[PDB]
Amino acid sequence: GTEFARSEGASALASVNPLKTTVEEALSRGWSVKSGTGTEDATKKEVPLGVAADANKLGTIALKPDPADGTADITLTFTMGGAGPKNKGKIITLTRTAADGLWKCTSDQDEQFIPKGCSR
Known part of the structure; x- marks a missing residue:
């Protein structure tokens, strides 16, 4: 009853939303994106996302496919x-469809805690 359920959802989305830019900039160069931290690999032409999987202690970030x-x-x-209890085990998913390059946000959280712009 005292869990910060709405702020947890906003913090989670704020950890992955900025990565859309990272992904688009890499694909515009014809380079692939790979998970984790590190340096660009000019041999395989792969750019890391630049954020650790556990950067936000509310959960873990993942990319699929990897590399993409x-x-x-x-x-x-x-x-x-x-x-906390209301959001533990819930997943916010950002999908970029390859056929049109568009992004969508879906969440399996309870409707009242889904961040603005995302749907069930």
């Missing part, structure tokens, strides 16, 4: 394994 080259749908997920 733009020719298949890409998903960025924030799994709230560190959240």
Whole structure:
């Protein structure tokens, strides 16, 4: 009853939303994106997302496929394994469809805690 359920959802989305830019900039160069931290790899032409999987203690960030080259749908997920009771186990998913390059946000949280712009 005292859990910060609405702020948890906003913090989670704020950890993955900025990565859309990172992904688009890499694909515009014809480079692939790979998860984790590190330096660009000029041999394989892969750019890391630049954020650790556990950057936000509310949960974990994941990329699929990994690496991703733009020719298949890409998903960025924030799994709230560190959240309070109402949001623990819930997942915010950002999907970039390869056929049109568009992004969508879906969440399996209770409707009242889904961040603005995301749907069930």
